[PDB]
Amino acid sequence: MRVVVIGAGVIGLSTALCIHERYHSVLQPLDVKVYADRFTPFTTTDVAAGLWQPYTSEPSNPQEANWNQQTFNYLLSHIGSPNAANMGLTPVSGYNLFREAVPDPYWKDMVLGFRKLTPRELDMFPDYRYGWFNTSLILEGRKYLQWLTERLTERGVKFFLRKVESFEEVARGGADVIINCTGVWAGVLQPDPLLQPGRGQIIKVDAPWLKNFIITHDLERGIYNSPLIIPGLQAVTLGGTFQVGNWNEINNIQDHNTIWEGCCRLEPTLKDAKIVGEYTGFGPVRPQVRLEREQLRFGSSNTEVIHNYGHGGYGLTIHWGCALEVAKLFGKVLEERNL
Amino acid sequence: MRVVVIGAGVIGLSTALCIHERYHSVLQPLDVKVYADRFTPFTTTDVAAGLWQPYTSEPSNPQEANWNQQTFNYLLSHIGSPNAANMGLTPVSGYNLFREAVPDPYWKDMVLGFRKLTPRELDMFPDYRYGWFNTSLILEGRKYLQWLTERLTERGVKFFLRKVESFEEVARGGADVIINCTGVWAGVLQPDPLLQPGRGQIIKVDAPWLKNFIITHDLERGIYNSPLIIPGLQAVTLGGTFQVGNWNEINNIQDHNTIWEGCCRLEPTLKDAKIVGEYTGFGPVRPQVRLEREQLRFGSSNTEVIHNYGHGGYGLTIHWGCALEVAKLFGKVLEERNLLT
Ligand SMILES: Cc1cc2nc3c(=O)[nH]c(=O)nc-3n(C[C@H](O)[C@H](O)[C@H](O)COP(=O)(O)OP(=O)(O)OC[C@H]3O[C@@H](n4cnc5c(N)ncnc54)[C@H](O)[C@@H]3O)c2cc1C
Numbered sequence: 103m104r105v106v107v108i109g110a111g112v113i114g115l116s117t118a119l120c121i122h123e124r125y126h127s128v129l130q131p132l133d134v135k136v137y138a139d140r141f142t143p144f145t146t147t148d149v150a151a152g153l154w155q156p157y158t159s160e161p162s163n164p165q166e167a168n169w170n171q172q173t174f175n176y177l178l179s180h181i182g183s184p185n186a187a188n189m190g191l192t193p194v195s196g197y198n199l200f201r202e203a204v205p206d207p208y209w210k211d212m213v214l215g216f217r218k219l220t221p222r223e224l225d226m227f228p229d230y231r232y233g234w235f236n237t238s239l240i241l242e243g244r245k246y247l248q249w250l251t252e253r254l255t256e257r258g259v260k261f262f263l264r265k266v267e268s269f270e271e272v273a274r275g276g277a278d279v280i281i282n283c284t285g286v287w288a289g290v291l292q293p294d295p296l297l298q299p300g301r302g303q304i305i306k307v308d309a310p311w312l313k314n315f316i317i318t319h320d321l322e323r324g325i326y327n328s329p330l331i332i333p334g335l336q337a338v339t340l341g342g343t344f345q346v347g348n349w350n351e352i353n354n355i356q357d358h359n360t361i362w363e364g365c366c367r368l369e370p371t372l373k374d375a376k377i378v379g380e381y382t383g384f385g386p387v388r389p390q391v392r393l394e395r396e397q398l399r400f401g402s403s404n405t406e407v408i409h410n411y412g413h414g415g416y417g418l419t420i421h422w423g424c425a426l427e428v429a430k431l432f433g434k435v436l437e438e439r440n441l
Numbered sequence: 442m443r444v445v446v447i448g449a450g451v452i453g454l455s456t457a458l459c460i461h462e463r464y465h466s467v468l469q470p471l472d473v474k475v476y477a478d479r480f481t482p483f484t485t486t487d488v489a490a491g492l493w494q495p496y497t498s499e500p501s502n503p504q505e506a507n508w509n510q511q512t513f514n515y516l517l518s519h520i521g522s523p524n525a526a527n528m529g530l531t532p533v534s535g536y537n538l539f540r541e542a543v544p545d546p547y548w549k550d551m552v553l554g555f556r557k558l559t560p561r562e563l564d565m566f567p568d569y570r571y572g573w574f575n576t577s578l579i580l581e582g583r584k585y586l587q588w589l590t591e592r593l594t595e596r597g598v599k600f601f602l603r604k605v606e607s608f609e610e611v612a613r614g615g616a617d618v619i620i621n622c623t624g625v626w627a628g629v630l631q632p633d634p635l636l637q638p639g640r641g642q643i644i645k646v647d648a649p650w651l652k653n654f655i656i657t658h659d660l661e662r663g664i665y666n667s668p669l670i671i672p673g674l675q676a677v678t679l680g681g682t683f684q685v686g687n688w689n690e691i692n693n694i695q696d697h698n699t700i701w702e703g704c705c706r707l708e709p710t711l712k713d714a715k716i717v718g719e720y721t722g723f724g725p726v727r728p729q730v731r732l733e734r735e736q737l738r739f740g741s742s743n744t745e746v747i748h749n750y751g752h753g754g755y756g757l758t759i760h761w762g763c764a765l766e767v768a769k770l771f772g773k774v775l776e777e778r779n780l781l782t
């Protein structure tokens with residue numbers, strides 16, 4: 103059984119590990135390989151702000167809420183581990199800030215200690231009038247990918263830096279099963295008109311005094327088009343743009359200004375923060391995650407493709423639930439093949 | 442007046458600033474000077490872990506609870522200001538951990554968002570069965586002293602390197618009022634057997650992933666004789682000793698191991714932390730803070746002394762309240778000389 107995972111961001115690597123950890127002991131032979139044309143530090147995953155938090159509105163698929171919860175439970179369960187920080191993980195507490203009252207989010211009980219903010223709390227943030235406080239987890243994309251690749255490599259999973267031109271070519275080269283974890287670029291391999299780039303630009307800063315996340319929301323402008331500040335393990339991420347349908351991979355000047363001015367207003371101690379980097383990435387925006395089996399029919403038998411893409415601005419937040427479900431679907435494939 | 446402040450730790454410098462702020466515009470000659478034999482980074486204050494948090498038990502002097510509250514509200518008022526971090530100040534959230542149920546602290550409404558830990562949170566800290574969460578503030582001693590000295594200097598308060606041997610010699614040099622902010626060494630200038638050293642040793646480490654304070658408690662071993670982890674602005678403080686009556690100023694290996702091993706068991710990701718420094722300091726432990734006026738006579742004139750020392754393991758936590766109180770007592774000195782505010 104030859105499995106080729108296409109993609110080496112959070113989705114592909116986590117899925118590869120989940121599959122290997124699940125079946126390595128019971129299925130012989132099992133060959134899992136990862137193909138991708140970008141590894142860390144060059145994926146979208148690497149640019150992510152690094153916070154566990156789903157969107158503020160519930161998902162269309164109720165499956166997705168459970169996948170987020172399963173991911174939170176997975177990550178939280180590492181917290182007393184000696185390797186938590188080496189995985190990119192640490193607990194962080196923080197603020198979600200609004201101009202008016204809004205309903206509690208669906209994930210209020212998944213996180214730790216959720217509550218509304220008190221009036222004394224809000225005076226820290228004069229431009230806002232209502233909010234939440236909770237504890238969540240930082241999962242730093244870059245570190246987590248480094249961790250996942252060490253885990254995979256240790257287990258004998260081989261990596262190939264390879265641009266895939268078609269599923270057909272990978273099937274013809276010997277894959278029995280393909281896991282399609284190509285993120286925003288999935289449409290190249292099979293058109294998908296629901297998949298769009300969520301263009302996000304960030305400024306990375308050394309401001310190690312900042313210990314709490316602070317996410318503001320502008321109801322008139324859509325999620326993450328409002329100042330956000332997320333402390334990472336070694337730097338702070340400043341954000342505030344998330345524009346659907348913009349394919350420009352170059353940083354631009356108005357977005358730099360939106361982020362810097364917005365964030366320096368939220369947190370004016372940033373006047374002394376040294377700029378580390380400025381970066382643009384494309385979230386794989388889609389009305390819902392595509393996670394499903396498809397049969398392909400080239401040559402002299404079928405190759406199964408299992409899609410796992412379209413996680414938008416919440417790929418780190420949802421990844422593990424998605425990985426588990428793919429491994430389950432892969433199990434259904436093995437059963438259909440009398441393995 | 443001519444005012445001499447003795448001490449350049451958090452207590453001396455904050456008190457100097459509060460007097461000067463309050464009285465510069467009503468007294469024409471106001472001459473405030475700081476004398477000290479140690480300046481940042483060489484004071485106790487510089488070794489302090491950083492955290493606003495009083496002892497878990499109520500103080501013998503209830504005024505101390507007002508002084509702590511006044512300090513929190515003061516510092517909190519600076520959050521959202523451009524210079525908070527330059528003052529050494531930033532918010533921080535964290536955990537207080539116990540091996541059995543305990544009463545809520547008297548300061549539970551002073552901090553932000555106080556509550557009990559839920560079972561999933563306690564699952565992060567397996568050796569413990571009960572605790573608190575809250576948000577408070579870091580006020581890093583080193584950074585705050587630097588800020589206060591710039592602020593004082595800007596207002597024309599002058600600093601002198603001086604080992605003061607007696608109040609008499611300062612009074613004879615012409616001071617109308619002496620503010621005694623000499624921390625654990627106050628007994629040198631006037632015996633005070635209630636004042637004792639609280640020897641605290643710490644390990645400073647580079648572990649910038651740690652965002653929360655974590656303080657454990659051992660009800661049988663006295664406060665801060667149990668592992669504690671306090672993320673600072675640039676590094677992390679590991680502690681776990683606070684031994685009263687010990688004057689030994691050198692680091693020792695047994696305390697090093699107690700702190701490292703205890704804190705590595707609390708927070709096992711510390712295995713990768715780089716050690717950046719190890720330090721010992723002496724909290725000025727007293728059953729209560731001494732904050733009072735005394736009149737001393739040398740020859741024909743009285744000299745006014747206002748003591749402000751004995752703040753134990755909570756000087757950063759309490760300082761601004763005490764500074765305001767010294768300013769109030771200075772007001773009374775003035776008012777006794779027919780001087781008007
Ligand atoms: C600025 C920003 C901040 C974010 N912050 C957060 C956050 O705090 N929390 C959170 O949960 N989410 C966040 N997200 C969203 C998150 O980054 C994404 O959902 C996630 O990284 C998507 O992962 P992925 O593995 O699908 O895609 P990617 O990380 O983009 O990986 C795609 C992989 O597919 C490979 N590939 C694609 N096509 C081919 C091909 N034809 N041949 C070979 N290889 C191919 C690529 O080389 C790469 O290895 C953020 C997104 C952005 C833009």
Ligand SMILES: Cc1cc2nc3c(=O)[nH]c(=O)nc-3n(C[C@H](O)[C@H](O)[C@H](O)COP(=O)(O)OP(=O)(O)OC[C@H]3O[C@@H](n4cnc5c(N)ncnc54)[C@H](O)[C@@H]3O)c2cc1C
Binds near residue numbers: 451622640
């Ligand atoms: C390990 C440790 C951790 C701590 N962590 C915290 C914490 O997180 N939060 C908190 O609130 N508190 C903490 N504390 C307590 C805090 O450090 C002290 O309460 C506080 O620093 C006392 O300040 P002070 O200005 O009175 O004394 P110091 O900072 O010792 O300053 C005394 C000044 O008096 C001068 N002086 C003394 N005698 C003379 C003389 N004869 N002539 C001239 N100058 C003289 C010294 O040179 C110095 O300038 C901690 C203490 C220790 C030991």
Ligand SMILES: C[C@@H](N)c1ccccc1
Binds near residue numbers: 341
């Ligand atoms: C905080 C995070 N979920 C985020 C930030 C910016 C763009 C997309 C997603």
Ligand SMILES: C[C@@H](N)c1ccccc1
Binds near residue numbers: 641665683753755
């Ligand atoms: C946490 C702090 N207030 C402290 C720690 C250790 C000794 C004295 C004081």
